[PDB]
């Protein structure tokens, strides 16, 4: 599968045409508030160095590879381990997040994917409700150079080529995340790649994380991907919610 041409997703999988996909254009006029959202609970991001981890140009996103005994809770009995990280974005003046606000796009997104604690592999998880959950952050323009994201944008060049690898050391993966981890948005769709599988739950931060300009052309100039293609616009379009309510953990 691709962005922007042929195989059509529903071939590749059927969930691609399912009625409750993602990712989706969150009006928070529109949200509902419910106060059983309590702040996101994050155990084992701060990494020592050692053991690398492997960030690979996969030909559709720049993937981290997460080690084992990050734990993840969206609440009282609602337990996940992280997998892996990736990223969407646009192009030279063109934005590439894949959810938006009021149709909003912005520069950028983080998805930092996790596994239920209830099932030992993603591919049982997979269309099971809540099986997977997704953390999502929109990566906005800020003054300085972000620290944390310098740590993976600086190897890029390493990993232009489509299929291409490296490592690197451990990291706070926590900063790579907003520090406000109390108002975020959260629905219930799919993954927003083949195979589109539903019952993943999203949660999407209010508060955004701010990457210097170059940071942001280097996230989107840098690598290459099918073919003899720059690896840009790699984001899937807005599916309409279709019945759903957002929820919000926010007045
Ligand atoms: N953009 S996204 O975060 O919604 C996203 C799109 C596709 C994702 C994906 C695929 N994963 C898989 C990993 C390992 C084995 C798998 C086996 C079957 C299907 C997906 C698998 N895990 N996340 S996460
Ligand atoms: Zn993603």
């Given amino acids: 599968w691709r962005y922007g041409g042929d195989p059509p997703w529903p071939r590749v999988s059927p969930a691609c045409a399912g009625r409750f996909q993602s990712?989706?254009?969150?009006?928070?006029?529109?949200?509902?508030?419910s106060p059983a959202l309590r702040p996101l609970e994050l155990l084992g991001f701060q990494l020592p160095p050692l053991p690398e981890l492997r960030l690979r140009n996969?030909?559709?996103?720049?993937?981290?590879?997460?080690?084992?005994?990050?734990?993840?809770?969206?609440?009282?009995?609602?337990?996940?381990?992280?997998?892996?990280?990736h990223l969407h974005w646009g192009a030279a003046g063109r934005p590439g997040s894949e959810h938006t606000v009021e149709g909003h796009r912005f520069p950028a997104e983080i998805h930092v994917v996790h596994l239920s604690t209830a099932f030992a592999r993603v591919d049982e998880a997979l269309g099971?409700?809540?099986?997977?959950?997704?953390?999502?952050?929109?990566?906005?323009?800020?003054?300085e150079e972000n620290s944390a994201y310098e740590q993976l944008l600086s190897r890029l060049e390493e990993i232009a080529e489509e299929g291409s690898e490296t490592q690197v050391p451990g990291?706070?993966?926590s900063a790579l995340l907003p520090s406000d981890f109390?108002?975020?948005?959260?629905?219930?769709?799919?993954?927003?790649?083949?195979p589109c599988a539903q019952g993943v739950i999203?949660?999407?931060?209010?508060?955004?994380?701010?990457?210097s300009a170059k940071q942001l052309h280097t996230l989107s100039d840098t690598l290459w991907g099918p073919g003899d293609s720059?690896?840009?616009?790699?984001?899937?379009?807005?599916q309409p919610l279709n019945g759903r309510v957002i929820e919000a953990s926010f007045p």
């Fill in 202 to 211: 999203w949660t999407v931060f209010n508060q955004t994380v701010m990457l």
């Fill in 58 to 85: 996969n030909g559709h996103s720049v993937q981290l590879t997460l080690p084992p005994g990050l734990e993840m809770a969206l609440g009282p009995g609602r337990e996940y381990r992280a997998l892996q990280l």
């Fill in 128 to 143: 099971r409700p809540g099986g997977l959950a997704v953390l999502a952050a929109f990566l906005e323009e800020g003054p």
């Fill in 23 to 33: 990712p989706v254009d969150i009006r928070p006029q529109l949200a509902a508030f």
């Fill in 171 to 173: 990291l706070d993966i």
């Fill in 230 to 238: 720059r690896l840009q616009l790699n984001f899937r379009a807005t």
């Fill in 182 to 194: 109390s108002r975020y948005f959260q629905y219930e769709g799919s993954l927003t790649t083949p």
